[PDB]
Design a protein around this ligand. Sequence first.
Ligand SMILES: OC[C@H]1O[C@H](O[C@H]2[C@H](O)[C@@H](O)[C@@H](O)O[C@@H]2CO)[C@H](O)[C@@H](O)[C@@H]1O
Ligand SMILES: OC[C@H]1O[C@H](O[C@H]2[C@H](O)[C@@H](O)[C@@H](O)O[C@@H]2CO)[C@H](O)[C@@H](O)[C@@H]1O
Lengths: 484, 484
Amino acid sequence: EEGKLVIWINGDKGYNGLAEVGKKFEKDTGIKVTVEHPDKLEEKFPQVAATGDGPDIIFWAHDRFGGYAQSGLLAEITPDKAFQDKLYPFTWDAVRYNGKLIAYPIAVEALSLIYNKDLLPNPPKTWEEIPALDKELKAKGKSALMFNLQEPYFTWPLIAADGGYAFKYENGKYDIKDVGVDNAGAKAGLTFLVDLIKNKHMNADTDYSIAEAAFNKGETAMTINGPWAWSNIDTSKVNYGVTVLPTFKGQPSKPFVGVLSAGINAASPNKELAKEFLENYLLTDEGLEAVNKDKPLGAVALKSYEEELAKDPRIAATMENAQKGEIMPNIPQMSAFWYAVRTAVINAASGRQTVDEALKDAQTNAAAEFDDVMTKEEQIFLLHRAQAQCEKRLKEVLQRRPCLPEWDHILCWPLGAPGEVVAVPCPDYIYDFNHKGHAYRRCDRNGSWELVPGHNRTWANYSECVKFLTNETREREVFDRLHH
Amino acid sequence: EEGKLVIWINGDKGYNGLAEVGKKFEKDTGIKVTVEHPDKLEEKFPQVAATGDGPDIIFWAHDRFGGYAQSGLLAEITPDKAFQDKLYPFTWDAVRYNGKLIAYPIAVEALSLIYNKDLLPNPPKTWEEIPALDKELKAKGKSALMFNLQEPYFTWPLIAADGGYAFKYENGKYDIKDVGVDNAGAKAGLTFLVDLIKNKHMNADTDYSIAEAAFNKGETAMTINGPWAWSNIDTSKVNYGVTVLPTFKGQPSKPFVGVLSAGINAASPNKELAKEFLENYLLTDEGLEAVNKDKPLGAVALKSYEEELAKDPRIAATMENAQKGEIMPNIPQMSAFWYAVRTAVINAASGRQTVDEALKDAQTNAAAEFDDVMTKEEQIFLLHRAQAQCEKRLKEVLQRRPCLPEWDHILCWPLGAPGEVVAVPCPDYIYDFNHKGHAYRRCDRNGSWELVPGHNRTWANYSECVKFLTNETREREVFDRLHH
Ligand SMILES: OC[C@H]1O[C@H](O[C@H]2[C@H](O)[C@@H](O)[C@@H](O)O[C@@H]2CO)[C@H](O)[C@@H](O)[C@@H]1O
Ligand SMILES: OC[C@H]1O[C@H](O[C@H]2[C@H](O)[C@@H](O)[C@@H](O)O[C@@H]2CO)[C@H](O)[C@@H](O)[C@@H]1O
């Protein structure tokens, strides 16, 4: 619906604060802003987004956005240099996919260890010593540690500590085929976690609300949660500290780093009003304070407002935990990774499967065999390998008038017969062309390739080759089909 | 350059009149309008258009626009119902390509027979009797007929009379493989034309300006030309009539029908100002009169201004000749057709080749083997043949709880294991997908496919399949490569 903004944001984040920014936007531009927090919005989005039940702006961590973008659900964002300099460049890095900017970076999230200072003046440096500490607190009618086991996000810091990883990065891209879910170190992490359930130290059933209300009512000594969760501990008036996670096997726990991002719906007719709201009303010391006051955002993208929160000890510990972690891949194969790791952790902790079986299946599910779709990078390699073959044929013709073989960035034209139109078969290596067509040049009477009239460019007609509209019309059909 | 309009239009059309409309536009919106008439603008366009040396608006006949559109050089035009009702629907038909509107129809052109009434009170009903009439006029120091032989556009009426054709139309599309350039009837037409050169009735060298200044100075009895050429005959004060072309072999001459169209450069940052100028300033009784006063447009698209010119006898004869002709295919394979037929006519009339050789080569050049690029139509056929196979597997599973195989407009999901995530390999028949990936559904505990949260749609994740962004990023690379 034109002339108003719908905004989806997670239900554990500061949506009431975001509403307050949207109130300010309505008073200043006369435009209604609706902030909504649906269950499972991250899987709700791709289906509904293109139906005008979807929002104008979606908030989530940067990992889901690779898939969204590749679904053609996000508009690309176009901020001017002046605005770009307001946010840390590494946050920009995170909302960058396939060389496009797909979102606005908001804040940087990382799991930390939150401990009850009064129940435990000194948080344990290692995971290994928790069993002993829990067995001690159980005697005092308490538990040592309780945290969301249902979500793979919270258990990963342990599973990644001794050697686990989502996808291997190398030479500036992710290997979708290489997954470190079932190596020696990951088994060590999950085996240890399963043992905690086995030995009655934790319950397998513990979900987000069970473990938070457990911590808030002083029933547990330690929780693992993110910045957003701090507001509730303050209301419950528990004397708490936020600290670096425990080491496992002398190796630091490696939490996934989330950059909360705001994306703009490609289907929204309110794109300009979206940009206007995000750049001028939300990403400002005031706007971020409003959200931050409701639930803490973590380390915000905005450099100016960041320097302020960067004196907060609770942030420092989130940043310390962020440096020790790994930033989540934002590639499309992530949703399979999450489903795989959820299944795995759930099955292992319940007993449905042994740790080794659970992870070996997760290995196979998460890991995708190479995409068969040709990427821009690969296409360019074929183009360079064809340019090469053109240097070669020109060097070999000249080694012993017709127009000379030349390379025009796409084809390699052969010796032209003077006065003639030269037809050359549209090159098979250009993935997108019609390889049955022909491209044309006029080779003039004197052995120079005819020129575009009154210009200094070589005339060539490629209209049999190019299928830009057809490719669109077809691909659009598949998109409409996927969405209506 | 933002905030002003550059307009390319042919040099034999009414560019001074179009300038006058552009003057009016500048006085009313404070926007500078430049009307330019470059040599060979129809082949100049594709190369320069994407360089900001190209125009905002290009005028040409509808045939070249298939190629332009497929080059992604034209913006699609979006006129409202109210405006669409102002122009005849068949002119709209002509500027329609692959189900998009790519231009604005301006006027309808057709070659006619122009005769000097004073040198010849009765124009010859047949082509056969011209030799006798010329041999008579030569004795009086004149010639019977002189017209542009250099361009295939003017010779085609004869070449298409006894059975020639560009591309066979069938079931609402052109067969690029089927060309009637070298059938029995086309040879008859070209043989006859070559005989006129042979027997000294016409000169092979006769180009556009030679033949018009010949007619205007009273040196020839008959010319073949279009509406645009009438203004000069009126200045030269020759008593002329415009009439239906001579029949050949008892068959009417079949001229190509051109719908002069105005297209908007996809690269232009002035698209809105383009639409504004074309809809409100040019396609109006006043605007078209201004152009029409400079050089006649033919039968204009605008119904209201058309009824006026539709009383002009000269138009009536163009319309009569239009009905007897064939409307030019606007497919991309046209430019090859033109190059093929030019070469052919040139070589035959000069003597470089015998008529049969000339046309058999034109046959091979003009005719393209089928496009290998999959079109939307074909992709849908594969989708329907996959839907079919789904009805089939559902009917055969039910012929003898799990979630039931069903068809979701793209894939056909197999029997689901209750409680499980169902992975299904991205379908190989979807040309645009990544056929290595997997699509996902949750089959719930009770044997119903899990639903998109709070909605009535079946949840499915296709993010491994879809490559909408990659396909763009890659194709864009090829476009930039073709243009810079
Ligand atoms: O649990 C898998 C889940 O992890 C991430 O979502 C986080 C989110 O980043 C946090 O802000 C917080 O609300 O917890 C969520 C998990 O409970 C991924 O972004 C998401 O795709 C994935 O499903
Ligand atoms: O002859 C090949 C040429 O024919 C057509 O162009 C015509 C044009 O439509 C007329 O309005 C007039 O100005 O003469 C032109 C050429 O004589 C085709 O439109 C064009 O593609 C083709 O090159």
